[PDB]
Amino acid sequence: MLDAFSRVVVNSDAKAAYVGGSDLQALKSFIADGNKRLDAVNSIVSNASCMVSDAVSGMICENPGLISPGGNCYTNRRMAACLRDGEIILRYVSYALLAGDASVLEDRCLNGLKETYIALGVPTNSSIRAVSIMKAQAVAFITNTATERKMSFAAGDCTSLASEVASYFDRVGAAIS
Amino acid sequence: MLDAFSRVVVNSDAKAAYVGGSDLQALKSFIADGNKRLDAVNSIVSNASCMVSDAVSGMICENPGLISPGGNCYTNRRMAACLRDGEIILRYVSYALLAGDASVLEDRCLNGLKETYIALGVPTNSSIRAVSIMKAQAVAFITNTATERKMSFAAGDCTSLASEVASYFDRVGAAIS
Amino acid sequence: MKSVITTVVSAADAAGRFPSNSDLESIQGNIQRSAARLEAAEKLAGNHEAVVKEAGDACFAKYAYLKNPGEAGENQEKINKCYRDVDHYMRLVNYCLVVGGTGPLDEWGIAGAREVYRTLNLPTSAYVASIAYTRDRLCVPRDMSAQAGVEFSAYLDYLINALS
Amino acid sequence: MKSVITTVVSAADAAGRFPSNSDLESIQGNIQRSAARLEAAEKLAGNHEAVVKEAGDACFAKYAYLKNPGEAGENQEKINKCYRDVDHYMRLVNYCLVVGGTGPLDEWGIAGAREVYRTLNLPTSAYVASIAYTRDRLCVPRDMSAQAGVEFSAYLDYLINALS
Amino acid sequence: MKSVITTVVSAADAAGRFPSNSDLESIQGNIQRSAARLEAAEKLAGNHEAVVKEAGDACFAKYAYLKNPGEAGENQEKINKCYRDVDHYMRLVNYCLVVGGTGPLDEWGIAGAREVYRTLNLPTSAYVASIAYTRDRLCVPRDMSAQAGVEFSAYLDYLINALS
Amino acid sequence: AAKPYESGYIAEDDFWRGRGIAAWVYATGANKVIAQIVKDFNLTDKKFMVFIPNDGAFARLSPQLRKAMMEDSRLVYDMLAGHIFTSKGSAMLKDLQGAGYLQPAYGEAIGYVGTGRVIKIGNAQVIPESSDILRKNLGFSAHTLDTFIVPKALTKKVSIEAGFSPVTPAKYVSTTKADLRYVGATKPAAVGGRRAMNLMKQQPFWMYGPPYNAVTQDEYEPISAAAPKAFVDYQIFAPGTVKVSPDSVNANELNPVSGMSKYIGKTQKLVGDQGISDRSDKLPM
Amino acid sequence: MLDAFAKVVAQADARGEFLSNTQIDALSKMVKEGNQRLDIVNKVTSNASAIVTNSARALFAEQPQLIQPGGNAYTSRRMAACLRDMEIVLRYVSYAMIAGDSSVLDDRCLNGLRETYQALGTPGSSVAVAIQKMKDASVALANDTTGTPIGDCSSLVAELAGYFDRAAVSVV
Amino acid sequence: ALILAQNDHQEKQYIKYPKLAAAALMASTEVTRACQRYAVPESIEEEFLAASVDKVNKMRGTTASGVYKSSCV
Ligand SMILES: *C(=C)C1=C(C)[C@@H](Cc2[nH]c(/C=C3N=C(/C=C4\NC(=O)[C@H](C)[C@H]4CC)C(C)=C\3CCC(=O)O)c(CCC(=O)O)c2C)NC1=O
Ligand SMILES: *CC[C@H]1/C(=C/c2[nH]c(/C=C3N=C(/C=C4\NC(=O)C(CC)=C4C)C(C)=C\3CCC(=O)O)c(CCC(=O)O)c2C)NC(=O)[C@@H]1C
Ligand SMILES: C=CC1=C(C)[C@@H](Cc2[nH]c(/C=C3N=C(/C=C4\NC(=O)[C@H](C)[C@H]4CC)C(C)=C\3CCC(=O)O)c(CCC(=O)O)c2C)NC1=O
Ligand SMILES: C=CC1=C(C)[C@@H](Cc2[nH]c(/C=C3N=C(/C=C4\NC(=O)[C@H](C)[C@H]4CC)C(C)=C\3CCC(=O)O)c(CCC(=O)O)c2C)NC1=O
Ligand SMILES: C=CC1=C(C)[C@@H](Cc2[nH]c(/C=C3N=C(/C=C4\NC(=O)[C@H](C)[C@H]4CC)C(C)=C\3CCC(=O)O)c(CCC(=O)O)c2C)NC1=O
Ligand SMILES: C=CC1=C(C)[C@@H](Cc2[nH]c(/C=C3N=C(/C=C4\NC(=O)[C@H](C)[C@H]4CC)C(C)=C\3CCC(=O)O)c(CCC(=O)O)c2C)NC1=O
Ligand SMILES: C=CC1=C(C)[C@@H](Cc2[nH]c(/C=C3N=C(/C=C4\NC(=O)[C@H](C)[C@H]4CC)C(C)=C\3CCC(=O)O)c(CCC(=O)O)c2C)NC1=O
Ligand SMILES: C=CC1=C(C)[C@@H](Cc2[nH]c(/C=C3N=C(/C=C4\NC(=O)[C@H](C)[C@H]4CC)C(C)=C\3CCC(=O)O)c(CCC(=O)O)c2C)NC1=O
Ligand SMILES: C=CC1=C(C)[C@@H](Cc2[nH]c(/C=C3N=C(/C=C4\NC(=O)[C@H](C)[C@H]4CC)C(C)=C\3CCC(=O)O)c(CCC(=O)O)c2C)NC1=O
Ligand SMILES: C=CC1=C(C)[C@@H](Cc2[nH]c(/C=C3N=C(/C=C4\NC(=O)[C@H](C)[C@H]4CC)C(C)=C\3CCC(=O)O)c(CCC(=O)O)c2C)NC1=O
Ligand SMILES: C=CC1=C(C)[C@@H](Cc2[nH]c(/C=C3N=C(/C=C4\NC(=O)[C@H](C)[C@H]4CC)C(C)=C\3CCC(=O)O)c(CCC(=O)O)c2C)NC1=O
Ligand SMILES: C=CC1=C(C)[C@@H](Cc2[nH]c(/C=C3N=C(/C=C4\NC(=O)[C@H](C)[C@H]4CC)C(C)=C\3CCC(=O)O)c(CCC(=O)O)c2C)NC1=O
Ligand SMILES: C=CC1=C(C)[C@@H](Cc2[nH]c(/C=C3N=C(/C=C4\NC(=O)[C@H](C)[C@H]4CC)C(C)=C\3CCC(=O)O)c(CCC(=O)O)c2C)NC1=O
Ligand SMILES: C=CC1=C(C)[C@@H](Cc2[nH]c(/C=C3N=C(/C=C4\NC(=O)[C@H](C)[C@H]4CC)C(C)=C\3CCC(=O)O)c(CCC(=O)O)c2C)NC1=O
């Protein structure tokens, strides 16, 4: 499991080169932008339950065949398992946003999730819609463009973090796609 | 004298407009590439001593009549004054490129220069050529395409600053004409 | 206009020198500080209708005698021209936040003001009352950021010190 | 890799809970101490071949018996691989100065080293004596800053206590 | 208790190793953020009966049906224990502001609360609505500092997401 | 819309221009649309109430919602009619306590929940600090909001997948030195000559030793194969012209206790630099 | 196999919805570069043998063990296989560069290359070092004028380097 | 004239009109008596120190040959 700091270590260990000079610009900019990163992971973590419930309710209210008798989110057991399935993916994307690298998302969440949903008969398309709704909630919560709740931030620009979390969210969709 | 920032202020003061968000896209792009403007000015002032003796000797090689007896560059005193000119014009052009505005060029150097060179008997055709060779050296030094001196730069494009200094040099040439 | 640019190239022009490393080094601070001093520029430019409004009545609330006959604000058009002057001064402060120096203030509001305000009986204390009322009503996380507020207040008090 | 981030996300993953305030509070200190450890790592990166050369001869100066036949430093192939292994350890120390924790040491140089050095007849005291010599030639204002020297000597003592 | 110290000594004890540099690096951030969270906790401690009285009223105002017979807020004994439980939750939030983590919440108010509130017919939405009202009445410069408000609202959102 | 001071700030639009809450109302032209909504529903006589989203509320509209608002004028009209309420007269902040409903000028009834000083009109929170403003002429009361009132009925076609997902373009960070050198390795060897070996880089000093034996660039050039028959006598010259200097005068610098020496033997190859040469500037021939 | 234009359509059918105007001016900009992109692929396919041979020569002057007797680069059969394995990755990087999307690169070049190199005993890290040396020469050869109009190409050479790094991390 | 002017119009005026720039430099040295006709040395040290500068200034009153120019008469 590698963060942003360990990624340059593994990149320069293939070099057998010391890290210093050229490779330090990204790390010093990562340090100088760290308050916005903590400020963004806190904003995602504070609104987790509303995000998961809103994403699963949106996925159902766009496709009502899931709660249809014989659908994949039909009974209470399947609905609770789907809420859990969404909550775990949000947890791992929050880990990857905190670490600044998506290696923890690959190793513990996405490694084999593709055919696990296949063996379960879980529909692939619906989960992508839930992931995209969670992505759209995450960018609005980071950039303080949420219509239902406004938070308190110091003024400035952090759309790089919004692009990074959008870059994590589509990655998950691709693996299960 | 003015610079690039105050240029839009006299434009807004002509209509009593506040400088709004429309006006600041031109100026925040002036700041974004602020490192390239300093890197472009530093390349010119580094080889400014070669540039005058490059250009004036090129102007001699084309018209031997200047070093002819009675010619305008015939005396050591007149040759020193011509080399003194080759440097004043190069100094004010590097002021105008640093400021991002041509204002300091045409009230401190070119205002009253044409009738001075007419009253002195300084040849105008020969002058134009000393400025054009310096312009050709400026575009070579900004775009790092000199034959026998290459300077270390970060990679990227610089034809906009080269076009700006090319726009200052024919302002000089049209002024002395 | 006196700015970071026009200072260092006139010092170089007076000495006949090329732009040295100090001249380039001075403009590097114009890269760092322009993130803060430009953030107050659109903040004042977008909400410039409530600040003139809130300064103009504070000027007359401090000095109610100006509406007496024979005084400076006796009729309506004189008060209309009085609000226009606070709009002019806030526009010049908006300009000075953009150039980065006290150029436009010193050219367009400061030079020659002490003659016209004495000739036309305009009290300078009533001029600095509105600028001071703008100065103490700066909520440093709410109006703007911290450094943008510092850059804004440093240009307001320069006008206050120059008018008195 | 053992670091500041990885410990707290591994703890939150073992507990199965979201990142709380204590986790973010632990990253503020990473933000604080990165100003010292990164400029320790950069100064190590810029001058590493001088230090690897300087610490390599202290090993053979302390233990001159390694160049005898039958030992582990007979010909030039052994001395070259000795300098290579010392450079490997200095590179791992540079890596741990960057990542903030002892991860790259514990997994690329320390784990399994005892079986290799016992099997290949490599005396660990002379792999230790170079690291010990490197620590003592560190003055507080000359080589780096004050906290950078603390950050450097802490990883040197970690490597020494691991191999001893 | 879930905190900054306890997570890293529990991780080092599970690994069976000494405290490394990453552990101490995690405590530097505790030293940093204690300047904000302690003066959040002190301001909560000095004015808690005003906030609890205010919090209780909001729940009833939102859910006026609780005072009907057959419900959980019939007589004064239920409303007094409602205010007591809201004061308990505010005290646990004050405790988590001091310890630096969500330990006192997770063990004294959250764990087991769902079985109690389902068994004793206590609607969790009204135990949530008081905490939700407390969060929205927090202005940035008036009630506390800027980072203290962030530290306070983070624990309020943690309690809200735990009970919802 | 001409000047806010002329004749003070008594006129309706000038009074609001003098307030600092909603500058965006005149920055854009929503003032004309709201006027057309006060004539399309005859709201003039009956005493209504209006909720104004302040500055900052407008500055935080999502890009995909702002795009929809700027590509469909009926959407703007509906959203603006949803901020004007006739249900209960010109009510202040003391009449919204409890959880009830308000009737918009056009939209469907919108739920509100007021608990003391914390009042929600659905999706939006009222800013109590600057509100409860009753205008006698044109009687209505005004309140400020932290957010636009956005009903789920109007923002059903707005999606982030429609082209508003945030993307930051990545860029390379090469240098002029590196690119100039590497470009010489793109020509065929029969043309490039020496430059065909220009893609090799310096390696750690121990990579050039016995086990690995990395080759330097000076070993690919004719300078490392020069062994001429002729020689310089070094005796023909008058005494005092031949010069000799060592690299140092010290035992354990010319050769340390170990075999790692920079001056004696075959270990003077094991140096960090010296792995490449800048002798490819001469020519391509 | 998709191009960058087929990407947005394949994500538009999935939601069952028309391309909004923001996707359209995202695409007309991508058309409006156009000539630069083909100038890039023209420069790489004009010098392909030089790129491959100079990268292999730098690889063996650097790592002499592959051509040492017993090395993976020993003999002619293996050496010939190594010469144009690199030319295969160069070909598919140029395909992905002209497509604007790394869909052909993952489908028929990088799909299963790792266990292919594992089943043969080929060291994948040296393949990655060869990929990096081809990358450096390709981005060096990409940004010269050579009789093209002056402009910036930076967002295109970043994508070209990204294709090379995607190929380099997937092999090893 | 361009270094003693305060506002930009005042420097633009000396720029456009050369006699105005000749007169401003004179009036600037008259109201603050830095001319030589009002400069009083204090010690004989400073009197010699002023004599050296004045000897340099008289040399530009002759030609490059050494012939007296028509200015210093
Ligand atoms: C007479 C007939 C005649 C000359 C004398 C000579 C002068 C000349 N040079 C150029 C083009 C350049 N001159 C430059 C100036 C310098 N070159 C240097 O490297 C040093 C730093 C400096 C002088 C010491 C430069 C940089 C150029 C651009 C190309 C380059 O890489 O050098 C011109 C104009 C174009 C031309 O005619 O070549 C002239 C007239 N050339 C003569 O023909
Ligand atoms: C720089 C050379 C590196 C290297 C190459 C190498 N490869 C092989 C063997 C094979 N390579 C493949 C690869 C492909 N087949 C394909 O169809 C495609 C298209 C996507 C690729 C990339 C295959 C099938 C083989 C086995 C067949 C054969 O080559 O005879 C070999 C050795 C040959 C052998 O194993 O007998 C080498 C040397 N290895 C290196 O050392 C360099 C790093
Ligand atoms: C130690 C634990 C810790 C936290 C709990 C958070 C809290 C936090 N946020 C910021 C500070 C900030 N946070 C943001 C981020 C944003 N602002 C916005 O307007 C956007 C909505 C959003 C990004 C999209 C910005 C822009 C700053 C200003 C400083 C900076 O740019 O780094 C700061 C530094 C300045 C300050 O003290 O206020 C802190 C401590 N960050 C931490 O380090
Ligand atoms: C570490 C990462 C990790 C995960 C991502 C999940 C992945 C995962 N999900 C399920 C299991 C499931 N996941 C879902 C979820 C869904 N089905 C749908 O129709 C929706 C599209 C979606 C909810 C949004 C459902 C409904 C089940 C239960 C299937 C069943 O009961 O037959 C299972 C089988 C075990 C079980 O839960 O019973 C696993 C391993 N678990 C993990 O450990
Ligand atoms: C028919 C079923 C149906 C639903 C269940 C909702 C679900 C829903 N919510 C949002 C969109 C959103 N959802 C949230 C999440 C929240 N907003 C808040 O105010 C709370 C704090 C939190 C839990 C409710 C946010 C923050 C946004 C975007 C910005 C905003 O609304 O402020 C989106 C748009 C996602 C996208 O752009 O693709 C959808 C589909 N809408 C529907 O059409
Ligand atoms: C502030 C702006 C400023 C300038 C631009 C210069 C330009 C300039 N040059 C001269 C004066 C001169 N300028 C030239 C120059 C030339 N003659 C040629 O044939 C060539 C085309 C050209 C050189 C390349 C010569 C030869 C003289 C001397 C004339 C003489 O001595 O009779 C003079 C008159 C003063 C004097 O006699 O020295 C001025 C103002 N000086 C300035 O102060
Ligand atoms: C005080 C003195 C002082 C300077 C001299 C400049 C020095 C300078 N130049 C650039 C940086 C740069 N300079 C160039 C310019 C060029 N590159 C080329 O290939 C062209 C030949 C040339 C065009 C004219 C480019 C393209 C960058 C990188 C982009 C940028 O930083 O804007 C940078 C940013 C990168 C860095 O070094 O960290 C700096 C500090 N700035 C200063 O503060
Ligand atoms: C570019 C900068 C700039 C300014 C600062 C103003 C300054 C200024 N004010 C007035 C003119 C005036 N200025 C005022 C203003 C005031 N009287 C008071 O008692 C208060 C102190 C203040 C209002 C708050 C009044 C009342 C007049 C009219 C006086 C007259 O007409 O004689 C005039 C004369 C011409 C005119 O009527 O406009 C000028 C130049 N104008 C400018 O162009
Ligand atoms: C990435 C982490 C990493 C490391 C830390 C090193 C660790 C390491 N060092 C050696 C290997 C060695 N280390 C030494 C060093 C010495 N023996 C002596 O006589 C002196 C005591 C001392 C000189 C300083 C020698 C001589 C060998 C080679 C042993 C041999 O081949 O016989 C080997 C055996 C393989 C080899 O190098 O040939 C390994 C794995 N290598 C790594 O890859
Ligand atoms: C980045 C890693 C790094 C280190 C581990 C140290 C180690 C170190 N010391 C010296 C070099 C030296 N070190 C000293 C020691 C001292 N001089 C003083 O002012 C102090 C009183 C005293 C330290 C206690 C002296 C006197 C020299 C020069 C003579 C020598 O070679 O030892 C050198 C050679 C380069 C140089 O001249 O500095 C190196 C690499 N320095 C480093 O840069
Ligand atoms: C140290 C941590 C700690 C806590 C967090 C609280 C948690 C808690 N609250 C209640 C208990 C309660 N909580 C409420 C509150 C309400 N019911 C309503 O009608 C409204 C919805 C709401 C008012 C705000 C009521 C009425 C009881 C008493 C339930 C009863 O006795 O029937 C009880 C049952 C025992 C009792 O208080 O008599 C407990 C354990 N107590 C603790 O010791
Ligand atoms: C320690 C915990 C703590 C809180 C959770 C808050 C909550 C809070 N707010 C108020 C009291 C108030 N709070 C406000 C609100 C505001 N006033 C402003 O300047 C802002 C614009 C706006 C916040 C967004 C107002 C106007 C009052 C006085 C009227 C009232 O009782 O609500 C009071 C009564 C004591 C007081 O007068 O402050 C309390 C406890 N304050 C605290 O001390
Ligand atoms: C461009 C920069 C900029 C500013 C300087 C402010 C300026 C400002 N704020 C307010 C208006 C206000 N200003 C404040 C702010 C405060 N009140 C206090 O008692 C505290 C000292 C301070 C916060 C710390 C408040 C609470 C209001 C609304 C009520 C009031 O007028 O006090 C007004 C009156 C007109 C209006 O309502 O908009 C003005 C001009 N706004 C800006 O956009
Ligand atoms: C067979 C395929 C084929 C092509 C690629 C193009 C080649 C080509 N490219 C350009 C046009 C261009 N080519 C470039 C490219 C570059 N400029 C540089 O300085 C960099 C070295 C390089 C970037 C990689 C640029 C930047 C333009 C346009 C000039 C501009 O946009 O300002 C033009 C001029 C017409 C136009 O501008 O559209 C042509 C004909 N034509 C073809 O028929």
Q: At a CB cut-off of 8 Å and minimum separation 6, what does F72 contact?
A: none
Match 């998302």 to its residue by tokens. A105
* DSSP letter string, C75-128: SHHHHHHHHHHHHHHHHHHHHHHHHSSSHHHIIIIITTHHHHHHHTT--HHHHH
Question: Could you say which DSSP state residue C64 is in?
Answer: G
Give the contacts of F150 (CB within 8 A, at least 6 positions apart).
A147, F65, F79, F123, F124
B153 touches chain F (CB under 8 A): yes
Q: Is G87 annotated as a binding residue?
A: yes
Residue from the list B12, B24, B45 with its beta carbon closest to the beta carbon of C18? B45
C-alpha dist (Å) from residue G63 to C67, F210, F211: 92, 13, 11
* Contact indicator for C38, C97 with CB cutoff of 8 Å: yes
Which of the 8 DSSP states describes residue E106? I
CB F121 within 8 A of CB F102: yes
State the Cα torsion C1-C5-C8-C10 to the nearest 10°.
-50
DSSP for E30-77, please give it. Answer: HHHHHHHHHHHHHHHHHTHHHHHHHHHHHHHHH-GGGGSTTSS--SHH
**CB pairs C-E closer than 8 Å:** 6
Strand order in the sheet with F110-115: F98-102, F110-115, F118-120
Question: With left for phi above 0 and alpha for psi between -120 and 50, is residue F208 left, alpha or beta?
Answer: alpha
Instruction: Please give the DSSP secondary-structure letter assigned to residue H70.
Output: S
- Give the pair of three-digit tokens for residue G152: 């910036």
Answer whether C10 sits within 8 Å of H8, measured CB to CB. Answer: no
B142 vs B147: CA distance, rounded Å: 13
F chain contacts of residue B155, beta-carbon cutoff 8 Å: 172-176, 179
Q: Which atom of ligand 2 is nearest to the CA of G85?
A: 22
Contacts of A155 in chain C (CB under 8 A): 39, 144-145
Whole-number Å distance between alpha carbons of C10 and H2: 9
In this complex, which of G22, G26, G49 lies closest to F67 when CB atoms are compared?
G22
By the 8 A CB rule, do G137 and G93 touch? Answer: no
Final resolution, Å: 3.0
Neighbours of chain E (3+ CB pairs under 8 A): A, C, D, F
Dig out the tokens for C158 from the structure: 């320069």
Write out the H or E segment, with its range, that includes residue C74: none
| Helix axes of B159-176 and B124-142: crossing angle, nearest 10 degrees | 170
CA gap F221, C73 in Å, rounded = 91
Between CA D151 and CA D40 the distance in angstroms is: 7
Mutate to test the pocket of ligand 14, among G41, G44, G46, G148 (most ligand atoms within 8 A of CB): G148
Q: Which two tokens stand for residue D123?
A: 């005396």
CB of G127 sitting under 6 A from ligand 2? yes
Minimal CA–CA distance to D55: which of D77, D86, D84, D78? Answer: D86
Q: What are phi and psi of B19, to 5 degrees?
A: -75, 105
D143 in helix, strand or coil? coil
CB-based contact H7 C14, cutoff 8 Å: no
Tokens linked to D33: 């101490």
Q: Which residue has the tokens 């000594």?
A: E9
SS (H, E, C) chain F: CCCCCCCCCCCHHHHHHHCCCCCHHHHCCHHHHHHHHHHHCCCCCCCEEEEEECCCCHHHCCHHHHHHHHHCHHHHHHHHHCCEECCCCCCCCCCCCEEEEECECCCCCEEEEEECCEEECCCCEECHHHCCEEECCCCEEEEEECCCCCCCCCCCCCCHHHCCCCCCCCCCCCEHHHHHHHHHHHCCHHHHHHHHHCCCCCCCHHHHCCCCCCCCHHHHCHHHHCCCCCCCCCCCCCCCCCCCCCCCCCHHHHCCCCCCCCCCCCHHHCCCCCCCCCCCCCCCC
Q: What is the DSSP letter of A18?
A: -
Which class for B89: exposed (0-12), middle (13-18), buried (19 or more C-beta within 10 A)? buried
Q: Are D102 and D160 in contact (CB under 8 A)?
A: no
Query: Which G residues in the span 97-136 are in contact with F, Cβ-Cβ below 8 Å?
Result: 133, 136
Q: List, as ranges, residues 76-105 from B with C-beta within 8 Å of H.
A: 77
- What angle is formed at CA B57 by the lines to CA B54 and CA B60, rounded to 5 degrees? 150
Strands F140-145 and F48-53: parallel
Q: Which residues line ligand 3 (CB under 6 A)?
A: A 35-36, 38-40, 42, 142-144, 153-156, 158, 161; D 24, 28; E 33, 146-147, 150
**Rounded to an integer, what distance in angstroms lies between the CA atom of residue A68 and that of residue D65?**
83
Please work out, in degrees rounded to the nearest 5, the angle formed at the alpha carbon of residue E91 by the alpha carbons of E90 and E97: 90
Domains and CATH numbers, chain C: 1-164 (1.10.490.20)
**Is C139 marked as a binding-site residue?**
no
Contacts of C145 in chain A (CB under 8 A): 154-156
Question: Torsion over CA of D87, D91, D97 and D99, rounded to 10 degrees?
Answer: -160
Q: Which two tokens stand for residue F57?
A: 């509320």
CA gap B69, E135 in Å, rounded: 93
Beta bridge partners of F112: F100
Find the radius of gyration of the CA atoms of chain D.
18
Q: Are G44 and G90 in contact (CB under 8 A)?
A: yes
**Residue D71: in which H helix or E strand, if any?**
none
* Tokens coding C31: 């890269």
- The answer to whether F180 faces chain B, any CB pair under 8 Å, is yes
F102 in contact with A, Cβ within 8 Å: no
Mutate to test the pocket of ligand 6, among B79, B85, B131 (most ligand atoms within 8 A of CB): B85
Instruction: Give the torsion sign (CA, B130, B133, B137, B143).
Output: positive
What's the rounded Cα separation, in Å, for the pair F136 and B103?
Answer: 56
- How far apart CA E143 and CA G164 sit, in angstroms, is 55
Task: Residue C25: name the closest of F236, B35, G103 by CA.
Answer: B35
- State the DSSP string of C128-152: HHHHHHHHH---TTTTS-HHHHHHH
By the 8 A CB rule, do E80 and E56 touch?
A: no
Q: Dihedral angle at the C-alpha atoms of H2, H6, H7, H10, nearest 10 degrees?
A: -50
- How many beta carbons lie within 10 A of that of residue F3, not counting itself? 13
In this complex, do G14 and A125 lie within 8 Å of one another by their Cβ atoms? yes
Using CA atoms, how far residue G126 sits from A125, E26, F206, G60, G65, in Å, is: 40, 39, 19, 10, 11
SS (H, E, C) chain B: CCCHHHHHHHHHHCCCCCCCCCCHHHHHHHHHCHHHHHHHHHHHHHCHHHHHHHHHHHHHHHCHHHCCCCCCCCCHHHHHHHHHHHHHHHHHHHHHHHHCCCCCHHHHCCCCHHHHHHHHCCCHHHHHHHHHHHHHHHHHHHCCCCCCCCCCCECCCCHHHHHHHHHHHHHHHHHHC
Q: How far apart are the first and last CA of chain E?
A: 22
3-state SS track over H25-62: HHHHHHCCCCCCCCCCCCCHHHHHHHHHHHHHHHHCCE
The C-alpha atoms of residue F54 and residue C106 are separated, in whole angstroms, by: 35
**CA-wise closest residue to F256 among A118, D60, C151, D52:** D60
Interstrand relation of F84-85 and F48-53 (parallel, antiparallel or unpaired): antiparallel
Element of type H or E holding D139? none
Q: How many CB pairs (< 8 A) connect B and C? A: 91
Cα–Cα distance between B100 and B94 in angstroms, integer?
A: 10
List Cβ neighbours of G94 (8 Å cut-off, separation of 6 or more). Answer: G41, G44, G45
Q: Of F163, F167, F70, F156, whose CA–CA distance to G21 is shortest?
A: F163
Q: CA-to-CA distance for A3 and D97, rounded, in angstroms? A: 15
Alpha helix stretches (DSSP H) within chain A: 4-13, 24-32, 34-45, 48-62, 76-99, 103-105, 113-120, 124-142, 159-176
C-beta neighbour count of D40 within 10 angstroms: 24
Determine the residue of G52, G60, G72, G115 to mutate for testing ligand 2's pocket, defined as the one with the most ligand atoms within 8 A of the Cβ atom: G72
Cα–Cα distance, H70 to H73 (Å, whole number): 6
Q: For residue A49, give the nearest of E140, E146, E161 by CB distance.
A: E161
Query: Which positions in chain B touch F173 (Cβ < 8 Å)?
Result: 154-155
Q: Determine the angle formed by the axes of helices B159-176 and B113-120, rounding to 10 degrees.
A: 50
- Which domains are present in chain B? 1-177 (1.10.490.20)
CB contact under 8 A, C6 and B99: yes
Question: Can you tell me whether residue H68 is helix, strand or coil?
Answer: strand
Experimentally determined by: cryo-EM
Return the ligand number nearest the Cα of F176. 7
E108 — phi, psi (to 5°)? Answer: -110, -15
Q: How far apart are CA D45 and CA D25, in angstroms?
A: 30
Q: Please tell me what DSSP assigns to residue H69.
A: P
